[PDB]
Amino acid sequence: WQSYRTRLNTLFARQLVARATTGIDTILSMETQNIQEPQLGKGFYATFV
């Protein structure tokens, strides 16, 4: 949209499948909630302090 990129889908579940192999206890862990997904097209991350 203009210069904006809005994420529509997620790969979270795709990765969750592996986490899930140890049961709920992992699924609901904080660590699981920190799963990362790929950036939206060409671009970069930067911290503007």
Place this chain on the structure above:
Amino acid sequence: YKSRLYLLWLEQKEITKTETDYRYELKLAHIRYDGTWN
């Protein structure tokens, strides 16, 4: 694949060309979290 159990298999379909020949297809399926299959 990705810790999920999948089955991968080959099937043969008999098709009239008369003469007979066969089509080959590969199918893949997996177990879902509730134990059922897709």
